[PDB]
Design an enzyme around this catalytic site. Structure first.
Site, PDB file in Angstrom:
ATOM      1  N   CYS A   1      -1.505   0.711 -13.646  1.00 14.67           N
ATOM      2  CA  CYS A   1      -1.628   0.719 -12.167  1.00 14.67           C
ATOM      3  C   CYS A   1      -2.831   1.601 -11.852  1.00 14.67           C
ATOM      4  O   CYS A   1      -3.814   1.476 -12.592  1.00 14.67           O
ATOM      5  CB  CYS A   1      -0.286   1.087 -11.537  1.00 14.67           C
ATOM      6  SG  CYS A   1       0.518   2.586 -12.247  1.00 14.67           S
ATOM      7  N   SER A   2      -2.790   2.513 -10.874  1.00 17.05           N
ATOM      8  CA  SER A   2      -3.944   3.444 -10.748  1.00 17.05           C
ATOM      9  C   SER A   2      -3.821   4.611 -11.742  1.00 17.05           C
ATOM     10  O   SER A   2      -4.757   4.763 -12.565  1.00 17.05           O
ATOM     11  CB  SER A   2      -4.167   3.909  -9.301  1.00 17.05           C
ATOM     12  OG  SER A   2      -5.463   4.555  -9.232  1.00 17.05           O
ATOM     13  N   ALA A   3      -2.708   5.371 -11.744  1.00 15.48           N
ATOM     14  CA  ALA A   3      -2.528   6.489 -12.724  1.00 15.48           C
ATOM     15  C   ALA A   3      -1.849   6.057 -14.028  1.00 15.48           C
ATOM     16  O   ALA A   3      -1.945   6.809 -15.017  1.00 15.48           O
ATOM     17  CB  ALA A   3      -1.759   7.641 -12.096  1.00 15.48           C
ATOM     18  N   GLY A   4      -1.208   4.899 -14.055  1.00 17.41           N
ATOM     19  CA  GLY A   4      -0.430   4.428 -15.224  1.00 17.41           C
ATOM     20  C   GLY A   4       0.893   5.162 -15.429  1.00 17.41           C
ATOM     21  O   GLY A   4       1.296   5.266 -16.614  1.00 17.41           O
ATOM     22  N   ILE A   5       1.557   5.625 -14.371  1.00 20.36           N
ATOM     23  CA  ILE A   5       2.892   6.303 -14.501  1.00 20.36           C
ATOM     24  C   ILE A   5       3.898   5.782 -13.506  1.00 20.36           C
ATOM     25  O   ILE A   5       5.113   5.806 -13.818  1.00 20.36           O
ATOM     26  CB  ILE A   5       2.714   7.843 -14.453  1.00 20.36           C
ATOM     27  CG1 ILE A   5       2.145   8.345 -13.129  1.00 20.36           C
ATOM     28  CG2 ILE A   5       1.883   8.329 -15.617  1.00 20.36           C
ATOM     29  CD1 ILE A   5       2.101   9.873 -12.984  1.00 20.36           C
ATOM     30  N   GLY A   6       3.512   5.373 -12.286  1.00 21.85           N
ATOM     31  CA  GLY A   6       4.492   5.030 -11.240  1.00 21.85           C
ATOM     32  C   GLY A   6       4.960   3.587 -11.289  1.00 21.85           C
ATOM     33  O   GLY A   6       6.057   3.309 -11.878  1.00 21.85           O
ATOM     34  N   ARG A   7       4.193   2.639 -10.725  1.00 18.01           N
ATOM     35  CA  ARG A   7       4.511   1.195 -10.874  1.00 18.01           C
ATOM     36  C   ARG A   7       4.639   0.822 -12.365  1.00 18.01           C
ATOM     37  O   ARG A   7       5.532  -0.002 -12.725  1.00 18.01           O
ATOM     38  CB  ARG A   7       3.466   0.320 -10.177  1.00 18.01           C
ATOM     39  CG  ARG A   7       3.344   0.623  -8.700  1.00 18.01           C
ATOM     40  CD  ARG A   7       2.171  -0.078  -8.046  1.00 18.01           C
ATOM     41  NE  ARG A   7       1.860   0.490  -6.750  1.00 18.01           N
ATOM     42  CZ  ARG A   7       0.825   0.086  -6.000  1.00 18.01           C
ATOM     43  NH1 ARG A   7       0.003  -0.864  -6.432  1.00 18.01           N
ATOM     44  NH2 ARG A   7       0.590   0.689  -4.837  1.00 18.01           N
ATOM     45  N   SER A   8       3.732   1.310 -13.199  1.00 20.09           N
ATOM     46  CA  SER A   8       3.725   1.029 -14.660  1.00 20.09           C
ATOM     47  C   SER A   8       5.054   1.485 -15.272  1.00 20.09           C
ATOM     48  O   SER A   8       5.618   0.744 -16.115  1.00 20.09           O
ATOM     49  CB  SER A   8       2.565   1.723 -15.340  1.00 20.09           C
ATOM     50  OG  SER A   8       1.298   1.149 -14.981  1.00 20.09           O
TER      51      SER A   8
ATOM     52  N   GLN B   1       7.247   8.054 -10.027  1.00 17.70           N
ATOM     53  CA  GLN B   1       6.506   9.138  -9.285  1.00 17.70           C
ATOM     54  C   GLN B   1       7.249   9.584  -8.018  1.00 17.70           C
ATOM     55  O   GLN B   1       6.871  10.691  -7.488  1.00 17.70           O
ATOM     56  CB  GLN B   1       5.140   8.619  -8.813  1.00 17.70           C
ATOM     57  CG  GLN B   1       4.084   8.626  -9.885  1.00 17.70           C
ATOM     58  CD  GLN B   1       2.785   8.021  -9.369  1.00 17.70           C
ATOM     59  OE1 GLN B   1       2.684   6.827  -9.069  1.00 17.70           O
ATOM     60  NE2 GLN B   1       1.795   8.858  -9.204  1.00 17.70           N
TER      61      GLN B   1
ATOM     62  N   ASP C   1       0.867  -1.208   0.000  1.00 11.46           N
ATOM     63  CA  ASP C   1       0.000   0.000   0.000  1.00 11.46           C
ATOM     64  C   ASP C   1       0.901   1.255   0.000  1.00 11.46           C
ATOM     65  O   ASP C   1       0.606   2.180  -0.797  1.00 11.46           O
ATOM     66  CB  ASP C   1      -0.996  -0.024   1.174  1.00 11.46           C
ATOM     67  CG  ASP C   1      -2.204  -0.949   1.022  1.00 11.46           C
ATOM     68  OD1 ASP C   1      -2.344  -1.596  -0.036  1.00 11.46           O
ATOM     69  OD2 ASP C   1      -3.041  -0.987   1.970  1.00 11.46           O
TER      70      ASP C   1
END
Ligand SMILES: Oc1ccccc1CN1CCOCC1
Ligand SMILES: Oc1ccccc1CN1CCOCC1
EC number: 3.1.3.48
Length: 283
Positions: free
Chosen positions: A215-222, A262, A181
């Site tokens: 992912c949620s925004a598509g920039i960090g984990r992605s 991010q 999380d």
């Protein structure tokens, strides 16, 4: 400059925040005018995360072609990726229209539907074989064929049917279920194993359309997933694996989608993942 000794050096000096801010300052700025049209407000999860006009994926329809998704095309590595937000209740039909139209073989999901007690994306795939999903707005049917649940990831086989032509295709859903999380994983071992399972599936190969990664925004984990994959391929292509510059690869990817990686901790984890993935491939 070799990355592993460098890593220890950046750790010793505690300068991750300063390196990360240098990337933020040098990153490309391109227009995103289509994303900001009033008719598209309910198609964006986050007001500050938009696809550039030059690299956005267009839906094949005359009414409204907009989806929050970008084509990342890595010329030297010969890899392409579509990076997208987690689908919203009103964009689950657009999401599957994009997978159909782009000829993708794989979807890579790096978040849980609920994290931190809030919804991070719609439940956009069926959970039971006998309860299929119909998307009436885009005329698609989606069926769960099989599910394999492992400690760190789940892989699903899905059948997507274009109801207009009665054509069917097999889509593979790779779901990384263990990202914490808060913060980043302590070890990159399970993330690297997951990457290797997506690779071994054929989902990243040039005989298929680009993989869809979210992912949620598509920039960090992605961003971490595509950055690690491209860097490790470049090490296997080049005479000198030590010439691969992770900061230069990240700035090349930021030409195609804003904000990739991010936090300074995600930057560290990426360097960590590339350093440890190099060691395992070595021999
Ligand atoms: O078809 C594949 C080939 C290589 C790797 C992964 C797959 C997908 N499998 C997931 C569940 O088991 C059957 C399909
Ligand atoms: O494929 C190889 C076999 C033997 C030695 C070196 C390589 C290249 N690796 C360098 C580290 O990064 C991934 C590729």
């Amino acid at each position: 400059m070799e990355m592993e000794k460098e890593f220890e050096q950046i750790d010793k000096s505690g300068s991750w925040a300063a390196i990360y801010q240098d990337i933020r300052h040098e990153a490309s700025d391109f227009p995103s005018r289509v994303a900001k049209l009033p008719k598209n407000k309910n198609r964006n999860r986050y007001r500050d995360v938009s696809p550039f006009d030059h690299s956005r994926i267009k839906l094949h329809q005359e009414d409204n072609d907009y989806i929050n998704a970008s084509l990342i095309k890595m010329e030297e590595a010969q890899r392409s990726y579509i990076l997208t937000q987690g689908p919203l209740p009103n964009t689950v039909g657009h999401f599957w229209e994009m997978v159909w139209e782009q000829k993708s073989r794989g979807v890579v999901m790096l978040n849980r539907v609920m994290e931190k007690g809030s919804l991070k994306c719609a439940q956009y795939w069926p959970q039971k074989e006998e309860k299929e999903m119909i998307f009436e707005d885009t005329n698609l049917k989606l069926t769960l064929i099989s599910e394999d649940i492992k400690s760190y990831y789940t892989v699903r086989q899905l059948e997507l049917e274009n109801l207009t032509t009665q054509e069917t295709r097999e889509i593979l859903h790779f779901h990384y279920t263990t990202w914490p999380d808060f913060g980043v994983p302590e070890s990159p071992a399970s993330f690297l194993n997951f990457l290797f399972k997506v690779r071994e599936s054929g989902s990243l190969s040039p005989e298929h359309g680009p993989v869809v990664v979210h992912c949620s925004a598509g920039i960090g984990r992605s961003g971490t997933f595509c950055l690690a994959d491209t860097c490790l391929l470049l090490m296997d292509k080049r005479k000198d694996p030590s010439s691969v510059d992770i900061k230069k690869v990240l700035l090349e990817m930021r030409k195609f989608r804003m904000g990739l990686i991010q936090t300074a901790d995600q930057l560290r984890f990426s360097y960590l993942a590339v350093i440890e993935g190099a060691k395992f491939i070595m021999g």
